Amino acid sequence: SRLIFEHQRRLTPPTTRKGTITIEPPPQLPRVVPPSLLRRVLP
Amino acid sequence: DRRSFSSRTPVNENPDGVQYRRGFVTRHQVSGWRFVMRRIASGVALHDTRMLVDPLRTQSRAVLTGALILVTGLVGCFIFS
Questions:
Q1: How many Å apart are CA B6 and CA B35, to the nearest integer?
Q2: B7 touches chain A (CB under 8 A)
Q3: Sequence-separated (6 or more) residues with CB below 8 Å from residue A32
Q4: What letter does residue B7 receive in the DSSP assignment?
Q5: What is the documented function of this protein (chain A)?
Q6: Residue B72 · residue B58 · CB < 8 Å
Q7: Using an 8 Å Cβ cutoff, are B28 and A32 in contact?
Q8: B28:A28 CB<8 A
Q9: Distance between CA atoms of residues B55 and B48, nearest Å
Q10: CA nearest B8: which of A31, A41, A15, A23?
């Protein structure tokens, strides 16, 4: 009646690299001094 | 050295900090907008956004030094007369 199956092993999909991706935090908002124009009109 | 103080804003937990309502623009916001608009204009023209060397700022500062040399030549030839 029916045919016969042979359980060949499963192919393997490209697995997800299940890890822990870390990002370095942004910088710390450095206080720029307003340029104090006497040292800005010279350039 | 001198033990300075970085800029800090903690969480509020209080019904006043939701009430600011003011839009005032700092120096950091306008410098960040200068950086973003110099990264976009170096991102639709140069087609690389690493921002190592930006040539559009070089060209625009070149024509601005041209206009500044014009203005200094005018103030130099006005004091001659």
A1: 23
A2: yes
A3: B27, B28, B31
A4: -
A5: Part of the ESX-3 specialized secretion system, which is required for siderophore-mediated iron acquisition and for the secretion of EsxH and EsxG.
A6: no
A7: yes
A8: no
A9: 12
A10: A31
